[PDB]
Design a protein around this ligand. Structure first.
Ligand code: JJI
Ligand code: JIZ
Length: 1157
């Protein structure tokens, strides 16, 4: 499913040169580093030779050396010159590499996009028929960008990294004959261990994901049917299950965090030591008088630098593979030679053709459904001047006879000839432009009428095409509203109705001036007044040329002289027409109060001191490194050299292991805090959802899947927001502060240069990142110019190919992408110049800083070891700054978004319910009055309902309030439970207003049942007990309620009734019997009033007969209000008081015919 060594065949010779020079520049840039390392090695060796000052006789005679210092400064001048030379060279070569590679990539993307659009716009219609619309355009938008990114930047950096790797190792094979073995023999063990660590991390992550999916799904379930959940008032009983399931996740997350942090600590341990090992073997070799300090430094620094570089190339290869796959698909679309081309200059030129259409053995089936043969052979001959009307169920399925006229499909063994010439020999474009097509629905574009008319044929004059449009129904639908010209009719700007779209489409068809016309569903389901005029246009078009008309409406059939239509594929001649039956008819977060949510200071205070002590490691490493170098440079080689070297190596590991245990403690506290905050925030958010009520849940802005993602992939954001954003900044600031102060202790002047060179590099990196991010943000805006035409073109391809206007869309796409082409070229140049800029300033600052340090050493004040200490400390601190930032969990990625969204939803107040300020009368008479109650949908206030409803309810009432649709009557029964609120109306119950009737105790007495008995995955016995849950929970009444519900006879299968739960649709109950289970739950509620809305969703049949049996037993037992849009249900209701929107009272059907049907 991939392709390689083919993605660049569409590049020109200049592009090949571009790529070659880019590769050469990348190779040079890669080779740059090892040479610099070797220079540094020999340069430090020269220091060690000169700066030894071992003999006091030289130190006293002739003003110390004062001449060896001259040789030293000459050597330093030469070294600094060669530094700046290689820095300028790296500048130039890196600029060349990045710029040429990215510009060649841009040219390739331009060519690929143009060819892709041209090919996809040229395929046969069946290709789109076996495919969809939006997915293709999404592919077009995404894969081109993926290919660009890859075969630009990633392949650009890959050769650079690989050349760096071979370079350092070659320096290794020159100066590190044994250093290489220890360094490369320690390499596999360290990398492998971190990998065993990555594998364990992945396993723990998968376990955590599986564990959270159990509970998250309990969650998705309680939400899906949240209306029932709030109706039965089981929030207090339900949050407990949510919490236990959540708990079987936070301990797993604690384990996962422990694993990740101990893995990081182990990686540090494997690096500090072994790095330690290298010094251990190198220093001993220097003691053996065969190697020097520079010899060790060059190989050690070089081999490692290269290994990093070679390891850095993995994401580049991943992007390359993605680009390979995407290129494979997009090329697969390309070169897909269709059966019809419509572009090749081939075929005979028919002229003065009458248009005698023919049909002989016409067999065809749609490629989407080849199983059903749409047409099974027809024999027919027609003559020009006699329009033919087809009558039947449809146009042979869907306008099939029309489809083969313009070669939109390919006939199978059937031959059609307009004038005795087969369509295959006739040129496709010429055949298209001589036949006019009328669409069933006239899709147009948001553009002015002028180009809509010009889409017909090659425009000769604006006035001429206007005169062509001067046919009837003009000057009113084209001049009154559209201001006589230049009005972008469509969804964007002065949207019109189809009555004018059909007329302008017919006007375009007349601009075609066809030999033959085709009419398809002129006014299919249009307004009955919009017709009777468009048909006049069709008739006057008929007077010009012969047409084939297919429509469901029979009005045109009388007008048509020849009526040759049938159904089922059996041809019926046009001898007579009377035989056929005549149918009658989001701000940011505080970052100070968010963390204040974590009131776990005993779990939190450990980290800050731990973070500082962790950041304190790196400058200590720099000090130890400087001391190791000074042991051989400013050393004591007469007396003792082994003692201090071995002591420094021991310091190397004790420091490594203390950093390891520091990371252990830091993880053990920070991951635990993050996981406990995860569970805390989630448990709150769940109860916040519960107190939000139906109002917010009915808001379409929030959906069930979106809210499940809200509970899923936003707590991890706060996890990083807690520790990472604080631990990282504390570590970085501690490192920088302690490095700065130790540099000040060991440096009074050079630190000024260090603090002057660091900020320019920092701001250069920041401006580079900001510029690339801004260009990426703009890329969407300029690429949307392509989409503004591509979306409409792909959507309306049927009409587009039905029209002759093909190349114009390609030209507009070419221009609207050519502007982004220049934009991308300039962006490429900016990216290249800024990358070369930052690299060049890095090298040049290295050179200048080291040269001025050398000058100050020649001043005999700060000796080399101090210079190396300060330089390495500052630069490694800055390098660690960004590196530590990367190890964080996407704080840079959107995170504060989910953070403050969670804050907002948690701070959300309860609009209604879940409060103690409720008055609960002990017993209720049930005297409800739904009189003068008016209220609408808060979520959709555009549609007002529930106007002027007057009702009276008493004990024994059987109000069968039934009305048309559901928008006017469902809310009536939906208001008894106060899911919504009455603001214009007033509701009285027991002489008391409902707004303070102890909402929980209110829902307690309501036996409401939803229309669809949606049920969650609780055990059947526990599911039945869920009725009166959060109330007294008791045994030996569930069986009593089940028996009273007359359900025991069927459910006695597996009579245990306790563990026979529905295991994710396992042991599925009958579709109509779930509502029976709902009835049983309502009965075990022991209400005083019951509300029913089940109606008959499925084919309940005999099961339905049993459910109104249950209903009538329930209503003769206790007062029940039945709501159902079924005539049989109300006829079953003996107490016939049907009221619909309050026009009538009591039994309407007896008083008037209205309620009956
Ligand atoms: C604990 C802290 N480390 C990190 O925060 C860290 C995380 S990722 C990484 N570093 C990279 C990938 S690792 S390179 C490497 C090099 C050599 C060996 N070995 O087994 O001899 C192992 C490894 N390794 O850990 O994969 N390191 C380099 O790019 C690299 C190449 S030269 C070099 N550093 C210089 C000489 N040393 C340090 O800067 C240094 C000393 S303390 C320290 N860093
Ligand atoms: S004193 C200026 C500079 N400091 C940086 O922090 C810096 C800017 S860009 C950068 N570091 C990249 C991320 N560096 C490396 O990838 C890297 C790993 S090892 C290494 N560089 C060599 C040994 N050191 C430098 O190149 C260096 C010296 S000064 C400096 N960077």
């Amino acid at each position: 499913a991939v392709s390689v060594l083919t993605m660049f065949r569409y590049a020109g010779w200049l592009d090949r040169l571009y790529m070659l020079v880019g590769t050469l520049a990348a190779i040079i840039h890669g080779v740059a580093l090892p040479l610099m390392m070797l220079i540094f090695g020999d340069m430090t060796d020269s220091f060690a030779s000169v700066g030894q000052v071992s003999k006091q006789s030289t130190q006293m005679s002739e003003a110390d050396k004062r001449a060896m210092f001259a040789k030293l400064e000459e050597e330093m001048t030469t070294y600094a010159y060669y530094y700046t030379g290689i820095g300028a060279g790296v500048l130039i070569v890196a600029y060349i590499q990045v710029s040429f590679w990215a510009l060649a990539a841009g040219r390739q993307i331009h060519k690929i996009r143009q060819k892709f659009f041209h090919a996809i716009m040229n395929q046969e219609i069946g290709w789109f028929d076996v495919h969809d619309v939006g997915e293709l355009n999404t592919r077009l938008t995404d894969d081109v960008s993926k290919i660009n990114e890859g075969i630009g930047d990633k392949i650009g950096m890959f050769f650079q990294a690989m050349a760096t790797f071979f370079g350092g190792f070659i320096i290794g094979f020159t100066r590190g004959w044994k250093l290489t073995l220890v360094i490369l023999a320690i390499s596999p063990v360290l990398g492998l261990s971190a990998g065993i660590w990555a594998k364990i991390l992945s396993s723990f992550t998968d376990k955590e994901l599986h564990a959270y999916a159990k509970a998250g799904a309990v969650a998705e379930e309680v939400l899906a049917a949240i209306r029932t959940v709030i109706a039965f008032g089981g929030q207090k009983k339900e949050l407990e299950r949510y919490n236990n399931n959540l708990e079987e996740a936070k301990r797993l997350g604690i384990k996962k965090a422990i694993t990740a942090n101990i893995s990081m600590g182990a990686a540090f341990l494997l690096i500090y030591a072994s790095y330690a090992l290298a010094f251990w073997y190198g220093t001993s070799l220097v003691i053996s008088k065969e190697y020097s300090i520079g010899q060790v430094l060059t190989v050690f620094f070089s081999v490692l630098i290269g290994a990093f570089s070679v390891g850095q190339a993995s994401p580049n290869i991943e992007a390359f593979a993605n680009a390979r796959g995407a290129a494979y698909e997009v090329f697969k679309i390309i070169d897909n030679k269709p059966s019809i081309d419509s572009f090749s200059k081939s075929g005979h030129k028919p002229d003065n053709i009458q248009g005698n259409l023919e049909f002989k053995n016409i067999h065809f089936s749609y490629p989407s459904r080849k199983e059903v043969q749409i047409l099974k052979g027809l024999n027919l001959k027609v003559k020009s001047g006699q329009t033919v009307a087809l009558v039947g169920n449809s146009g042979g399925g869907k306008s099939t006879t029309v489809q083969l006229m313009q070669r939109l499909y390919d006939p199978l063994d059937g031959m059609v000839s307009i004038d005795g010439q087969d369509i295959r020999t006739i040129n496709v474009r010429y055949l298209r432009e001589i036949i006019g097509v009328v669409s069933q629905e006239p899709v147009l574009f948001a553009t002015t009428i002028a180009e809509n008319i010009r889409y017909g044929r090659e425009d000769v004059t604006m006035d001429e095409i206007e005169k062509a449009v001067k046919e009837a129904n003009a000057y009113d639908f084209i001049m009154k509203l559209p201001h006589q010209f230049d009005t972008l009719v469509g969804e964007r700007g002065a949207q019109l109705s189809g009555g004018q779209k059909q007329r302008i489409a017919i006007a375009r068809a007349l601009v075609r001036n066809p030999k033959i016309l085709l009419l398809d569903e002129a006014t299919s389901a249009l307004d009955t007044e919009s017709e009777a005029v468009v048909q006049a246009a069709l008739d006057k078009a008929r007077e010009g040329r012969t047409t084939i008309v297919i429509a469901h409406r029979l009005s045109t059939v009388r007008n048509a002289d020849v009526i040759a239509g049938f159904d089922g594929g059996v041809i019926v001649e046009q001898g007579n027409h009377d035989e056929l039956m005549r149918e009658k008819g989001p701000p940011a977060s505080f970052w100070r109060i968010l963390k204040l949510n974590s009131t776990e200071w005993p779990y939190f205070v450990v980290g800050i001191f731990a973070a500082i002590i962790n950041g304190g490691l790196q400058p200590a490493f720099s000090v130890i490194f400087s001391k190791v170098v000074g042991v051989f440079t400013n050393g004591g080689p007469p007396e003792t050299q082994r003692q201090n070297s071995n002591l420094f190596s021991l310091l190397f590991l004790i420091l490594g292991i203390i950093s390891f245990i520091t990371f252990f403690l830091q993880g053990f506290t920070f991951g635990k805090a993050g996981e406990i905050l995860t569970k805390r925030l989630r448990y709150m958010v769940f109860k916040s959802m519960l107190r939000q009520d139906v109002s917010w849940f009915d808001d379409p802005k929030n959906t069930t899947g979106a809210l499940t993602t809200r509970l899923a992939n936003d707590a991890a954001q706060v996890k990083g927001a807690t520790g990472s954003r604080l631990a990282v900044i504390f570590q970085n600031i501690a490192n920088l502060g302690t490095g700065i102060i130790i540099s000040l202790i060991y440096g009074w002047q050079l630190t000024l240069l260090l603090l002057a060179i660091v900020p320019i590099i920092a701001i250069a990196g920041v401006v580079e990142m900001k510029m690339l991010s801004g260009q990426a943000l703009k890329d969407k805006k300029e690429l949307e110019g392509s989409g503004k035409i591509a979306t409409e073109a792909i959507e309306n391809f049927r009409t587009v190919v039905s029209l002759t206007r093909e190349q114009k869309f390609e030209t507009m796409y070419a221009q609207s992408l050519q502007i982004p082409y220049r934009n991308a070229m300039k962006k490429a140049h900016v990216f290249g110049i800024t990358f070369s800029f930052t690299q060049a300033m890095m090298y040049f600052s290295y050179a200048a800083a080291f040269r001025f340090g050398a000058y100050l050493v020649t001043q005999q004040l700060m000796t080399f070891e101090n210079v190396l200490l300060v330089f390495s400390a500052i630069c490694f601190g800055a390098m660690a700054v960004g590196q530590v930032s990367s190890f964080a969990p996407d704080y840079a990625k959107a995170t504060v978004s989910a953070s403050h969204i969670i804050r907002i939803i948690e701070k959300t107040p309860e609009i209604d319910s879940y409060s103690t300020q409720g008055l609960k009368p002990n017993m209720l008479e049930g005297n409800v009055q739904f009189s003068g109650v008016v209220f609408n949908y808060p979520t959709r206030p555009s549609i007002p309902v529930l106007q002027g409803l007057s009702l009276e309810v008493k004990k024994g009432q059987t109000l069968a309030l039934v009305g048309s649709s559901g928008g006017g009557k469902s809310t009536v029964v939906q208001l008894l439970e106060r899911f919504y609120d009455p603001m214009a109306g007033s509701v009285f119950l027991d002489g008391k207003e409902i707004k303070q009737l102890n909402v929980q105790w209110l829902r307690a007495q309501l036996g409401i049942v939803s229309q669809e008995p949606i049920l969650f995955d609780r055990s059947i016995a526990e599911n039945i007990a869920y009725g009166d849950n959060s109330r007294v929970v008791s045994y030996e009444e569930i069986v009593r309620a089940a028996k009273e519900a007359n359900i025991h006879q069927f459910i006695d299968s597996l009579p245990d009734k306790y563990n026979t739960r529905v295991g994710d649709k396992g042991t599925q109950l009958s579709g109509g019997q779930k509502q029976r289970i709902a009835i049983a739950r309502a009965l075990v509620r022991q209400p005083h009033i019951l509300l029913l809305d089940e109606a008959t969703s499925a084919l309940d049949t005999e099961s339905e007969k049993v459910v109104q049996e249950a209903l009538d037993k329930a209503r003769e037992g206790r007062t029940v209000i039945v709501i159902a849009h079924r005539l049989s249900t109300i006829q079953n209701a003996d107490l016939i008081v049907v009221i619909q929107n309050g026009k009538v009272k009591e039994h309407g059907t007896h008083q008037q015919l209205l309620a009956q049907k």
